[PDB]
Amino acid sequence: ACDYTCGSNCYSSSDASTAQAAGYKLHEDGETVGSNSYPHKYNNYEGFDFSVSSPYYEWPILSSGDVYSGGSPGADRVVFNENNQLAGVITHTGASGNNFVECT
Ligand SMILES: Nc1nc2c(ncn2[C@@H]2O[C@H](CO)[C@@H](O)[C@H]2OP(=O)(O)O)c(=O)[nH]1
Ligand SMILES: [Ca+2]
Ligand SMILES: [Ca+2]
Numbered sequence: 001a002c003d004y005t006c007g008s009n010c011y012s013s014s015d016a017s018t019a020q021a022a023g024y025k026l027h028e029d030g031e032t033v034g035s036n037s038y039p040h041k042y043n044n045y046e047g048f049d050f051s052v053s054s055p056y057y058e059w060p061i062l063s064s065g066d067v068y069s070g071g072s073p074g075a076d077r078v079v080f081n082e083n084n085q086l087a088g089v090i091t092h093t094g095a096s097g098n099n100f101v102e103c104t
Contacts, residue, residue: 006076006103007093009063019078020086022067023059033070034060042079042087046100050087056080061089076103 002010023039032038042056050056057080060073075092077100088102095101 004089004103006061006089006091009076009091009093009103011061011076011089011103015061015065016078016086016089018067019059019061020080020084023057023078024080024084026059027057033068034073036073038068038073042077046090048088048090048100048102050079052081052085052087053083055082056087058090 003013004011004016026032027039032040039057039059042058044050044054044056058077059080060068061076061078062068062074063076077090079087079090081087090100090102092098092100
């Protein structure tokens with residue numbers, strides 16, 4: 001079973017933790033990768049009801065199981081905060097334009 005389902009993509013908690021750890025490390029070191037400069041602040045324009053505190057940062061989580069290193073980011077993202085807490089997993093899949101919807 002999937003802990004997070006982003007469209008057709010199936011993710012386990014371990015996938016989210018592995019992705020979050022990579023993005024958090026880059027955040028703490030003040031570095032970014034990719035043309036879109038990940039990780040970067042997530043403003044929560046969508047108004048998701050995150051239970052943890054801000055600031056929030058988005059980082060790509062890949063369907064292949066591989067850790068993002070600068071290529072195409074795909075549609076899915078893990079959102080984490082300043083205290084290394086997972087806020088949520090979201091996706092562009094099933095959403096209009098560049099909006100996000102939450103993964104189930
Ligand atoms: N949809 C959305 N985009 C955000 C948010 N916070 C930052 N962004 C960025 O705002 C711009 C319009 O969506 C994009 O550059 C997007 O970054 P990403 O495209 O890297 O996600 C947010 O809360 N929602
Ligand atoms: Ca996996
Ligand atoms: Ca692999």
